[PDB]
């Protein structure tokens, strides 16, 4: 019974979290800049990984 209540609370927390993150374009302008900076950092890391993959492919080709 207690495990069922804990699972129900976890599911409620998860649905509240997804319902909150889908409304993210309604940010209160407090944490929007930090999220944009984190997204830019993730994009830079992905670009670095892609460049490393291209360099490894060009090296293995030679």
């Amino acid at each position: 019974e207690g495990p069922q209540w804990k699972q129900k609370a976890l599911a409620a927390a998860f649905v509240i979290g997804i319902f909150a993150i889908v409304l993210f374009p309604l940010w209160p302008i407090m944490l929007r800049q930090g999220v944009w900076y984190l997204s830019v950092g993730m994009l830079g890391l992905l670009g670095l990984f892609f460049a490393l993959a291209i360099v490894r492919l060009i090296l293995f080709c030679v």
Binding site: Q4, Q7, K8, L10, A11, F14, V15, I18, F19, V22, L23, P25, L26
Partner: protein
């Protein structure tokens, strides 16, 4: 973990015994008209029109309109489908077995995620100030428009099962996108809306224009010269090119290399295993169109803000809405024949990119889809079928000799068809024609195989 949410979400009842083919076709034809009439109806409370349309290039791939009841369209269904297919492929949760209750909970979770994302999309569309302004429109109409969008989202997400659970001949997603392309073709052909750009008003339709410009114009030579091939509005030549591409793709879909096979569990029975030249049909061009639309949207959204930059200027420069002199410009298809003839390097690089991308996408998708030689040969060995060769000819060798060539050739072939239909000037993009042909062909084959 979503057990308690199961009795709450409504699901369409299963068929009692079975459904014939006529009743199935009637169900489909009656549930598609509802989608259409709902897509053509305007919402309430719309105030601020004539506003820039975000996700414009996605409206061709995703059935929707400007301000109708179907603004959410089918995006929640496909979004949930893609995210959960990615989760299943990446193997994050234990939901892989074919248990009945496992798949039931999986579908329940998919429906719940779809409806919650539909609610989120409706809320963000309302509160982003797209239809109007929350302070200007009022505090009473906002919740009314919210519920008016969420009710339609619920209607469509619950109506998808009416086609998927068994009452429909196919799926629901492959129809709401295959009907809009035929809609666009027929409306581009028989358009009644006139466009008076000076020197007499003309018709937007093709046949209507060929009749009008011929009946009320002197100098019939100059009346047909601007009716057969005019560049401003759709003409007859584009319609004939679309007809030619349609006939060519119908004829080319049928190429198949049958392989002889006889069973070994029950002696004597023969058969054949076909492997079409369009292996993974309409998957590579779909992936390429999705990638092109995604990179175009990214480049446009970056140029709308950081236009004064070096890498942004090298990525793509937009202008009236159409990229030019950039990477997105090279990825953009040529407009017409003269536009292709003015710059040869653009056409060359676009041809090469299209062919290579389609071929490689087919080659890498044939492994994820599960139709690889090492997989289909094992499946046939499990089913009991053995190669009907001369003296115990193996199956894996011939199968792995035939399949990869077929895939890597079909990818380039469908890419070449799309690029030829785009360069020749066929009505609608080549992707639309290919989708509208392939989906209808698959449904015809399914209908011929099931009953009739």
């Amino acid at each position: 973990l979503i057990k308690p949410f199961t009795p709450l979400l409504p699901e369409v009842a299963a068929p009692e015994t079975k459904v014939p083919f006529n009743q199935k076709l009637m169900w489909t034809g009656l549930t598609l008209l509802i989608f259409l009439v709902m897509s053509q109806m305007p919402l309430y409370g719309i105030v601020s029109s004539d506003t820039s349309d975000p996700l414009y290039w996605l409206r061709m791939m995703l059935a929707s309109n400007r301000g109708t009841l179907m603004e959410l369209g089918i995006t929640p269904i496909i979004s949930s489908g893609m995210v959960f297919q990615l989760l299943a492929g990446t193997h994050l949760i234990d939901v892989n077995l074919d248990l009945k209750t496992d798949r039931e909970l999986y579908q329940t979770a998919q429906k719940l995620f779809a409806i919650i994302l539909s609610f989120g999309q409706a809320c963000v569309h309302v509160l982003t100030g797209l239809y109007g302004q929350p302070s200007d429109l009022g505090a009473g109409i906002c919740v009314l428009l919210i519920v008016q969008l969420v009710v339609a989202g619920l209607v469509v997400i619950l109506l998808d099962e009416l086609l998927q659970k068994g009452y429909g001949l196919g799926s629901g997603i492959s129809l709401f996108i295959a009907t809009n392309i035929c809609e666009s073709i027929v409306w581009k052909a028989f358009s009644p809306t006139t466009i008076n750009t000076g020197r007499g008003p003309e018709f937007e339709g093709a046949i209507i224009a060929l009749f009008h410009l011929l009946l009320t114009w002197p100098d019939k030579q100059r009346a047909l010269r601007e009716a057969f091939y005019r560049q401003s509005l759709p003409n007859i030549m584009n319609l004939l090119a679309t007809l030619l591409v349609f006939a060519a793709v119908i004829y080319l879909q049928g190429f198949r290399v049958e392989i002889p096979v006889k069973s070994a569990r029950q002696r004597g029975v023969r058969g054949s295993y076909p492997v079409r030249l369009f292996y993974t049909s309409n998957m590579p061009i779909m992936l390429q169109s999705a990638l092109c639309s995604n990179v175009f949207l990214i480049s446009q959204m970056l140029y709308s803000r950081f236009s004064d930059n070096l890498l942004v200027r090298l990525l793509g420069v937009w202008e009236p809405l159409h990229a030019a002199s950039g990477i997105a410009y090279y990825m953009s298809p040529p407009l017409n024949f003269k536009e292709a003839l003015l710059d040869p390097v653009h056409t060359v690089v676009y041809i090469t990119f299209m062919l290579v991308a389609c071929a490689l996408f087919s080659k890498t998708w044939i492994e994820v889809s599960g139709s690889s030689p090492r997989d289909v040969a094992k499946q046939l060995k499990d089913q009991g079928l053995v190669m009907a060769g001369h003296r115990e000819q193996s199956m894996y060798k011939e199968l792995k000799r035939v399949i990869p060539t077929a895939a890597a050739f079909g990818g380039a072939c469908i890419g070449a068809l799309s690029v030829a239909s785009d360069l020749l000037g066929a009505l609608g993009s080549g992707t639309g024609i290919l989708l509208a042909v392939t989906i209808i062909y698959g449904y015809f084959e399914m209908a011929a195989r099931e009953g009739d």
